[PDB]
Amino acid sequence: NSVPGAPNRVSFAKLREPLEVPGLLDVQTDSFEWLVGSDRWRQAAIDRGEENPVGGLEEVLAELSPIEDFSGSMSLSFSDPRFDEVKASVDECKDKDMTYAAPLFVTAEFINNNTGEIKSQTVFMGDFPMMTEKGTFIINGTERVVVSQLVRSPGVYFDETIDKSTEKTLHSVKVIPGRGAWLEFVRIDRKRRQPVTVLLKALGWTNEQIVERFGFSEIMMGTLEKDTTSGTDEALLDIYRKLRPGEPPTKESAQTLLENLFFKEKRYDLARVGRYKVNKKLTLTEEDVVATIEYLVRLHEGQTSMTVPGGVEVPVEVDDIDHFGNRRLRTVGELIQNQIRVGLSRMERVVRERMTTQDVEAITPQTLINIRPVVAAIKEFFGTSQLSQFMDQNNPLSGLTHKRRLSALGPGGLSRERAGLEVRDVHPSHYGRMCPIETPEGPNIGLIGSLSVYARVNPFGFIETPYRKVENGVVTDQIDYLTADEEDRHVVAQANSPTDENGRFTEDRVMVRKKGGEVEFVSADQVDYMDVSPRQMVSVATAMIPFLEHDDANRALMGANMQRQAVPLVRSEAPLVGTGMELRAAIDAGDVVVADKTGVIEEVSADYITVMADDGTRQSYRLRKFARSNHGTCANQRPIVDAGQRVEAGQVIADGPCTQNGEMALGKNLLVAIMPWEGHNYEDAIILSNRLVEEDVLTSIHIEEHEIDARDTKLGAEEITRDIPNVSDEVLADLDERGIVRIGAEVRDGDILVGKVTPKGETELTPEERLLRAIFGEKAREVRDTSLKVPHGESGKVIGIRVFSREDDDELPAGVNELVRVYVAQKRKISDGDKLAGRHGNKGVIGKILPVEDMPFLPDGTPVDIILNTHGVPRRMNIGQILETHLGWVAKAGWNIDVAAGVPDWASKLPEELYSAPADSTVATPVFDGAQEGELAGLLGSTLPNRDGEVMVDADGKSTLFDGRSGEPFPYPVTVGYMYILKLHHLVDDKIHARSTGPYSMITQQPLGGKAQFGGQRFGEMECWAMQAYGAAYTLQELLTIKSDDTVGRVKVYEAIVKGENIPEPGIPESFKVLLKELQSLCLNVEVLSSDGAAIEMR
Amino acid sequence: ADSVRAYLKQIGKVALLNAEEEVEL
């Protein structure tokens, strides 16, 4: 709706969206456009707000300018940052393994105060990685995402903790800056035993001022009365030895210590967040450190209002660190800014010192500037940083939620292990800002969350939510974005409250949220603002669960997580029963092709689509075709338009991997039967119609990337070649001249992809080997065979080949002559052992797939595709999955009213224009206003036919299925319908592993785990416990000796199995021999003694 | 606490020579 080509999907929503969903990729683009400060951000901050917009880059550049040594004789000044056009295109970078970047330029002015000369020089800072339209970065060729971090905003926050002993009240205040040491009430720099009074005198304030300013504070006088410090300089000395123990002080150092620590701007960093927080709540000013202690004493006393001695009144109350008013949220632009600031300060060090030893008047902006640390900050931020992640793409939805994710971990925030469950719990202020229903199930719960649908980030880093202000029981069209602080100020009316004519309060009383937040029921009298719509609190994926309101938050969370876990199917059918978001989540993802100008289609090819605008301009779009995604899913796109077609701006020209006709399709609509069936679908297992194989409905493609390089070796140069030292001409049968597999070839496990060879010697062949050489006349070849073969358990067709050669100009790291990448792809039929699931958190493996002949089949002879077990459903509170199973049948078979004569009672509340839909029409039930139970039943009866006028499902959503095995009907009516089930990225082909012998570890001889290494299974501590409880000594010994660590015994056992002899006696585990050696290296003398003869030697 | 702080404390206890003493030594 409101989207030009939007498909027709009827909604049961009884409300009207007053506000379109904002562009939900915005959080990434705005943060970056602020950092680079392009005119797009300029106009934004000019047309509203402050009149001197300072880009993030300029903002950190103001801090540097100027650079002046202690002499002030020279000053190096910076200004005017500039970017050139991007080096290469995104597509070019992903291919060539480079990073998408614009070179940055700066004007550096060096001034000599003695000679009054000026030297102006243009400076090259480095290639500054830019952000794609899609909100990502290309770093060394891989698409990456910078997640936004949650942090404690700089400010003064007070906490009241009851005494562990006396039970008496205590505060306990803290002040956290942008940078510099932190203080707590004066406990400073983690130095206890500090009275808050001794420092108040350290500034030079005499005691009478204490008695004057302290006033009503009793412990304020008793602390100075107990404190033995006499004089302002003597207190600085009691502060000097606690802060700087080991250094005898000086009156010059005693005074500047306090001044330099906080007041001085260089050492103590005033934050715009901190500067704004406390300035209203009450660099660092002496005025500010007094108001701190004043606020505190007037807290423990119990008064709610503090009027500063010269200041303005504010409430005196405790602060909550989990309240979003106090919690940001450093966005990507800022995370980059901070890393740039670090790079400059490291350069300022070399700029300052450089001035001293450089011959004066021979120094220029360049000679003082060395850019190594500045670019290193950026490069070392995108790599190795936890906030910079490889974009998660198996489907557009996964990518779209990766951006919009906010996590509390990372540098500048708490560690995952330390933070308690108080931060993980949902706060009342998360409403409409951070989705409560979406987080990881692992022990990241509550630390990671996704930004809500209508949420929006503030220039200061606080999340805002849209509201519609109400005045005198009338809700206006005014929409005001409020932060958490200003939301606690007012009364938020519930999103759905009855609307009156031109609009006003209808219901006698209004649903409202207080500042508790504590819910309340008051009449229309006292309201100020109302909710923009239901699902403000919900996130994008959460908003995609039909009948969300019917599923417990537990199964909902699982449901959201698993949608982003699905994989694009070849066919990509859209959900029969949807919600609002499917349309707008797919376009905002960027994996769909949208037209930016109204016009008409000149050409449509599988390769590209051109449109002739009414503007006379010509736009074209190249289609992503079978592109391998980060985790190996398929990004293939298909055009949905035809040559003659007219089109409008913002319409959808081509479908992406998971989309159909513009809306997200994460799965297929399947005919479901909820009976338990012969113990096959049991304990969450699922059974499938073989139809889903024959007709490729659950089929999906997959693409693997294989890589090999030819480098320079101390003994020669590696050469890619077709000549392999020992092989039959058969293995080479699929290799071309150069020795790389031919396009379109079929490759099995162990087949050669790229032949390679490396020098070897001196060889010293075994005599038994040199004799066969003489006999069969095959010269021992000069070089070893190191060649690229396909990993165990993999297979497919060769799709494409990429070759980078040093002979060709190309490019490569030093030593690497030639690089060849091979892309293998395969069609994966839905297979027993694959994992499927619905949007409600219902998941299970495929346990069996039956011939379409024997399956529960409707009276039509229409077989059911899936049989889901009845037992898993009732106890899990996911019953929404049964609703959509019913609606699924409705939407598939169509229906009619219900009229005439009149409209029935249930439809009165009311389906509008919904009275009739044809067969196969698609439905939408927005989460928190969907279809309602009454409306389901009324629809459940409707409508024939299969073809013949007979009806296949009753008003209970049940049918009589015939067993395709015995041919007799099933005694009772069974529920059938259509359910939307997704194919998930856990697949049997990837998860099946087996090993007999294989590589062993270097230091320990144990087999090395993981499929890459062909590894074995870990038999762990707990497994050995189980083995010991059984009393199997020989089994336990075996697993721990000749099956892992025993270097002679593992080769003997093999020798025994192949000769059918008895399995020999085990030896000593190599790991134990290693332990003795490691204890010896600690100067621990560890001797293994027998009964005697005393010491035994391990050798 | 720090090892470099420890070494600076001791080298600080000596006194800087002027030109005449350096010649003397």
Swiss-Prot record, chain A:
Highest taxon listed in the record's lineage: Bacteria
GO biological process, one term: response to antibiotic
Matches recorded under InterPro entries: DNA-dir_RNA_pol_bsu_ext_1_sf (IPR042107), DNA-dir_RNA_pol_bsu_external_1 (IPR019462), DNA-dir_RNA_pol_su2 (IPR015712), DNA-dir_RNAP_su2_dom (IPR007120), DNA-dir_RNAP_su2_hyb_sf (IPR037033), RNA_pol_bsu_bac (IPR010243), RNA_pol_bsu_CS (IPR007121), RNA_pol_bsu_protrusion (IPR007644)
SUPFAM superfamilies: beta and beta-prime subunits of DNA dependent RNA-polymerase
A GO MF label: DNA binding
Effect of D392V: Rifampicin (Rif) resistant
Keywords annotated in UniProt: Antibiotic resistance, DNA-directed RNA polymerase, Nucleotidyltransferase, Transcription, Transferase
Entry's Gene Ontology cellular component terms: DNA-directed RNA polymerase complex
Gene3D superfamilies hit by this protein: 2.40.50.100, 2.40.50.150, 3.90.1100.10, DNA-directed RNA polymerase, beta subunit, external 1 domain (2.30.150.10), DNA-directed RNA polymerase, subunit 2, domain 6 (2.40.270.10), RNA polymerase alpha subunit dimerisation domain (3.90.1800.10), RNA polymerase Rpb2, domain 2 (3.90.1110.10)
Catalytic activities: RNA(n) + a ribonucleoside 5'-triphosphate = RNA(n+1) + diphosphate
Substitution effect: D392Y: Rifampicin (Rif) resistant; RbpA no longer rescues transcription in the presence of Rif. Decreased affinity for Rif, no change in affinity for RbpA
Reported effect, L409P: Rifampicin (Rif) resistant
Enzyme Commission numbers on file: 2.7.7.6
Keyword Nucleotidyltransferase among UniProt keywords: yes
Pfam families linked: RNA_pol_Rpb2_1 (PF04563), RNA_pol_Rpb2_2 (PF04561), RNA_pol_Rpb2_3 (PF04565), RNA_pol_Rpb2_45 (PF10385), RNA_pol_Rpb2_6 (PF00562), RNA_pol_Rpb2_7 (PF04560)
Note: Mutations in the RRDR sequence (residues 423-449) confer rifampicin (Rif) resistance. Rif blocks transcription initiation but not elongation.
Quaternary structure (record): The RNAP catalytic core consists of 2 alpha, 1 beta, 1 beta' and 1 omega subunit. When a sigma factor is associated with the core the holoenzyme is formed, which can initiate transcription. Interacts with RbpA, which partially restores Rif-inhibited transcription.
UniProt similarity note: Belongs to the RNA polymerase beta chain family.
Entry function: DNA-dependent RNA polymerase catalyzes the transcription of DNA into RNA using the four ribonucleoside triphosphates as substrates. This subunit often mutates to generate rifampicin (Rif) resistance. Interaction with RbpA partially restores Rif-inhibited transcription; once the subunit is Rif-resistant however RbpA no longer stimulates transcription.
UniProt name for this protein: DNA-directed RNA polymerase subunit beta
